[PDB]
Write an enzyme that holds these catalytic residues in place. Structure first.
Site, PDB file in Angstrom:
ATOM      1  N   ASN A  47      46.327  36.055  39.257  1.00  0.00           N
ATOM      2  CA  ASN A  47      46.601  36.192  40.896  1.00  0.00           C
ATOM      3  C   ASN A  47      44.723  36.837  41.402  1.00  0.00           C
ATOM      4  O   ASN A  47      44.051  36.135  41.634  1.00  0.00           O
ATOM      5  CB  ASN A  47      47.302  36.956  41.227  1.00  0.00           C
ATOM      6  CG  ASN A  47      48.451  36.039  42.636  1.00  0.00           C
ATOM      7  OD1 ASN A  47      47.975  35.176  42.338  1.00  0.00           O
ATOM      8  ND2 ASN A  47      49.864  36.577  43.349  1.00  0.00           N
ATOM      9  N   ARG A  93      56.333  39.605  37.684  1.00  0.00           N
ATOM     10  CA  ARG A  93      57.282  40.310  36.769  1.00  0.00           C
ATOM     11  C   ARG A  93      56.872  39.121  35.132  1.00  0.00           C
ATOM     12  O   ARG A  93      56.569  39.829  35.009  1.00  0.00           O
ATOM     13  CB  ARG A  93      58.123  40.510  36.841  1.00  0.00           C
ATOM     14  CG  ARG A  93      58.667  41.645  36.381  1.00  0.00           C
ATOM     15  CD  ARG A  93      59.980  41.735  35.756  1.00  0.00           C
ATOM     16  NE  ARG A  93      58.794  42.649  34.559  1.00  0.00           N
ATOM     17  CZ  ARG A  93      59.487  43.879  34.165  1.00  0.00           C
ATOM     18  NH1 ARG A  93      60.906  44.589  34.652  1.00  0.00           N
ATOM     19  NH2 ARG A  93      58.840  44.707  33.052  1.00  0.00           N
ATOM     20  N   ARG A 140      49.748  44.404  40.258  1.00  0.00           N
ATOM     21  CA  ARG A 140      51.843  45.447  39.579  1.00  0.00           C
ATOM     22  C   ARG A 140      50.943  45.992  38.132  1.00  0.00           C
ATOM     23  O   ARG A 140      51.616  47.004  37.711  1.00  0.00           O
ATOM     24  CB  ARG A 140      52.136  44.371  39.171  1.00  0.00           C
ATOM     25  CG  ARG A 140      52.842  43.813  38.401  1.00  0.00           C
ATOM     26  CD  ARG A 140      53.476  42.581  37.918  1.00  0.00           C
ATOM     27  NE  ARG A 140      54.744  43.384  37.991  1.00  0.00           N
ATOM     28  CZ  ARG A 140      55.601  44.010  36.998  1.00  0.00           C
ATOM     29  NH1 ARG A 140      55.471  43.959  36.000  1.00  0.00           N
ATOM     30  NH2 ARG A 140      57.039  44.901  38.021  1.00  0.00           N
ATOM     31  N   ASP A 169      56.924  35.111  45.261  1.00  0.00           N
ATOM     32  CA  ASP A 169      56.305  35.465  43.835  1.00  0.00           C
ATOM     33  C   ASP A 169      56.023  36.843  43.233  1.00  0.00           C
ATOM     34  O   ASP A 169      55.640  36.830  42.390  1.00  0.00           O
ATOM     35  CB  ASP A 169      55.068  35.284  45.402  1.00  0.00           C
ATOM     36  CG  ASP A 169      55.007  33.169  45.401  1.00  0.00           C
ATOM     37  OD1 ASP A 169      55.166  32.786  44.913  1.00  0.00           O
ATOM     38  OD2 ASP A 169      53.817  32.990  45.749  1.00  0.00           O
ATOM     39  N   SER A 191      44.712  38.052  52.417  1.00  0.00           N
ATOM     40  CA  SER A 191      44.709  39.308  53.991  1.00  0.00           C
ATOM     41  C   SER A 191      42.241  39.600  54.035  1.00  0.00           C
ATOM     42  O   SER A 191      42.207  40.338  54.927  1.00  0.00           O
ATOM     43  CB  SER A 191      44.858  40.222  53.132  1.00  0.00           C
ATOM     44  OG  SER A 191      46.518  39.902  52.764  1.00  0.00           O
ATOM     45  N   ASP A 224      35.776  49.708  50.254  1.00  0.00           N
ATOM     46  CA  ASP A 224      37.534  50.204  50.375  1.00  0.00           C
ATOM     47  C   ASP A 224      38.057  49.780  48.556  1.00  0.00           C
ATOM     48  O   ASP A 224      38.263  49.864  47.938  1.00  0.00           O
ATOM     49  CB  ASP A 224      38.477  49.697  51.198  1.00  0.00           C
ATOM     50  CG  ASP A 224      39.268  50.140  52.372  1.00  0.00           C
ATOM     51  OD1 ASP A 224      37.806  50.842  52.768  1.00  0.00           O
ATOM     52  OD2 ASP A 224      39.497  50.161  52.629  1.00  0.00           O
ATOM     53  N   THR A 271      45.676  33.129  47.806  1.00  0.00           N
ATOM     54  CA  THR A 271      46.363  32.584  48.733  1.00  0.00           C
ATOM     55  C   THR A 271      46.999  34.459  49.254  1.00  0.00           C
ATOM     56  O   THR A 271      47.617  34.585  50.201  1.00  0.00           O
ATOM     57  CB  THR A 271      47.670  31.904  47.961  1.00  0.00           C
ATOM     58  OG1 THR A 271      47.844  31.048  49.429  1.00  0.00           O
ATOM     59  CG2 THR A 271      48.308  32.382  48.445  1.00  0.00           C
TER      60      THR A 271
END
Lengths: 258, 285, 301, 281
Positions: D135, D66, D235, D61, D181, D165, D176
């Site tokens: 994402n 990238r 990224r 993934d 998380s 945060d 996902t």
């Protein structure tokens, strides 16, 4: 009395009544009195720590959890500061060591939270969390909080943990943003050992204690957190119950109660 | 006079190899088996109806978690220790599995095993100031909506001051031991079996704060059932039911009468947690 | 022959703002329908034609029996969320707009409060509200291969465990394939509109009303993954109720109940015909949420 | 002349077979290492895929992302083949490389637009930075310690103000990943919606919101705190001035996703999370 502060000028009315009757080894004294916030209290505790004396806290600005009295009652406190009469109660403190190749390389303490945390801002921390000598979970995450019942109300609360009343004795573990199916907070007898195992292959990581003393976790090392032998000493007064503080703090609805 | 053990078994499996092995060993040692009539009615050996079967030294349970809990109701009575062996599935309370039966029996006989007092909760339903029912639980006290649809107005009080008023499907008050069961389903944290604390998990609370709260073993948790609403229900250990009347008040406290648990050389809680939930643990130390 | 009809629906026992409907609806040569129940008791406190013509209102066409009956322009519920859900009930047959004015508590589905019924009724007359299709669900129960009962929902389909004790075993399949098998108290297949109700309670996220999706929130799943899932509008949620266990029940919108036999299979799908919602210049869903959950909002532009 | 950019993580058997078949078929191959004429090795550059018909990716993934960056910048499809690990984003797995190549050659694959998020940092009426995400936009605490002040707003109207945060704004594909998380719900990738998920918010309502794909999610950064960070697709970083206002909307031109006869999401989900599934049907 050491006096740590900071409209914060009820600061004077303290020196008035006390004389009526450099931070590091700045202890030397019999009591620490703090006028400020929850963060300030954590700061004073730092200081009261080394020459194990009590801490007392007077809420100036906001409404927190640790201070045992409001500002608009600084006199009714001084009476008790003079009188030496308050019950000083020992409170669960966490001890943390950092160990590479079997050898202790760094060491620290908290009264709220040991917050192991991601190094680089991007990516995840591989971590194996371990409880009484056995592993419970391997997952990637932003970190792991190991928390005290007092601290269960700070960051660990944000990370999604449960609220622990302050007179309980337990160690709380809240995985912080774990990419995994069970990231459930776990709670544990005060006698236990939480160990977290930082990924050998990954990057280094950080820990933070009481959100103020930083350590450096080398990749591949092991955090051991256990209950500490020398607690922090807390002054206690005719303060409101923890329950009331939680309620006020969070404006929790309580209508209809008998 | 003689030694006797009560055997409680799930019922047919390799539950019979194990039962017979039990009948065999104790026979050889002049310890009398005792079994429950319903269980012995689909086929020294006494046979008791199920109310107070005591006179015994140990309640040996052959089966699973829910079975242990039935057995403990039986043991609570004459306050004698309970020991459980797993037959089919993976559970939290048995101290061994059938494939180690023979070894347990060496201990049953020698009586050398450890006997821990696991924390037990005490519940009183109180109306108008006057206690109108009582119960006890080793896993959970589950206060729950009476009628299927609607919500249950509740105020939760801890140590004498109110913590939260909301509507819900219910409120769980849980033992560390019971944190694994219904409480977990409802969103609760796992507490380790040796910790002594009390856990409260609001059940399906329509409201912002419905966090689990955890409390020391000396606290009183009280839940006030809305007066105008409908009568609620409490369940202890998913087996004993009390009708909570509208407007009453539920107090849960640590019981002074712990369930005696017969302890063995068994797996730590961690390991069992991992097994039950298939917890991913590769990479460890 | 040609004509204008408007169905009142009310929570019987501020129900006289209902005659303020009956007044204004008359001088405008409208309709005012009512049901059987609506006119065998109060709501029709003023039940009589000795009042319905003395008012100048060709009004009360009590004629209508509940459910599969009527050909109007609008349904105007005064009452609550409970009631809007009732009205929607009917309306779905006739496939026509529903407009709710709020008597008591603050609801998520009401377009206004009674202190406004003046203006409301003015907009009713002018037909100058907005109509807007909200997602509606279709549920079938399928046993031994074939449909054996069927239902529909605007808010939730709540599959609930039958007996009080023990637990209901369930396999949840989405678009053909299984996604989780667990024991639970049940499972909610909810609409965006319904993510505010029981689904919220059960831990679901809040979905904006305009969204087109389907929300699945396992109720008290005894499992590591019992996350809420959100699915595209055209997926198919199926829950198979385990065979050895007990029967179960589902409730649609907290009212249309169906028994679900052990070993049967629930299939929920978006329904071809959406419910239609009359819409005014009202609070956006955001403000309603902030009000009903009393959300902290301050230090803003 | 037809050309393809190949983005491989650097594993070689697959990479060779690609080199091989695209030779045999007259399609130019640009190879880019992911760590960073008939064939070219290309520098890591935002314009690497500027001429190709397709971006093909071998890897998990993170690599997909990238590659997606580049495919987006050249406004063409991306296609992923998984190598080592299990991912949500690839359309096929290494063992089926041949079959895939056949479609690559054939140019017979469906290409579906997939919702992409557009983000702007605006301050005092001027737009002062910008980005996009397939994402997640991850708004985050600047300083490692302390909390971040935040007011979250939906179609101009505030919904919540808390310390946190950060705040995740996520694409259904995204739900996902880090969003998951953070406590998020799981969203089927065909769904068109925007997901908001507060990140470690010290408040009672940290609850995920899901919004129609026409909404404007804005986040106002406390004027008195420190700068914050935003990260895109794990990224692309962006500094966020104190006092500014993040805005995330659905982008006008989305990422093109080559599709294939792959497993449905449900399976992908069950596969990754080792989801218990017995007794079905």
């Amino acid at each position: 009395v050491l006096l740590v502060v900071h409209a914060t000028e009820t600061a004077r009315r303290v020196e008035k009544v006390l004389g009526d009757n450099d931070q590091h080894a700045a202890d030397g004294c019999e009591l620490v009195l703090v006028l400020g916030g929850d963060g300030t209290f954590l700061r004073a505790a730092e200081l009261a720590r080394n020459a194990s004396i009590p801490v007392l806290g007077v809420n100036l600005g906001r409404i927190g959890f640790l201070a045992e009295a409001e500002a608009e009652a600084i006199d009714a406190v001084l009476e008790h500061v003079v009188a030496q009469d308050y019950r000083v109660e020992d409170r669960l403190t966490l001890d943390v060591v950092v160990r590479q190749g079997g050898r202790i390389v760094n060491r620290g303490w908290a009264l709220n939270e040991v917050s192991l945390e991601k190094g680089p801002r991007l990516g995840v921390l591989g971590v194996v969390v371990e409880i009484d000598g056995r592993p419970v979970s391997a997952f990637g995450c932003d970190g792991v909080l190991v928390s005290t019942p007092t601290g269960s109300t700070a960051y660990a609360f944000s990370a999604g943990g449960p609220v622990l009343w302050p007179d309980l004795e337990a160690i709380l573990v809240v995985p912080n943003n774990a990419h995994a199916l069970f990231g459930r907070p776990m709670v544990t007898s005060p006698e236990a050992t939480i160990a977290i195992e930082i990924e050998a292959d990954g990057h280094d990581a950080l820990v933070f204690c009481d959100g103020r003393r930083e350590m450096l976790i080398p990749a591949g090392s092991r955090l051991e957190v256990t209950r500490c032998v020398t607690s922090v000493k807390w002054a206690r007064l005719d303060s409101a119950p923890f329950t009331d503080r939680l309620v006020r703090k969070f404006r929790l609805p309580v209508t209809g109660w008998r």
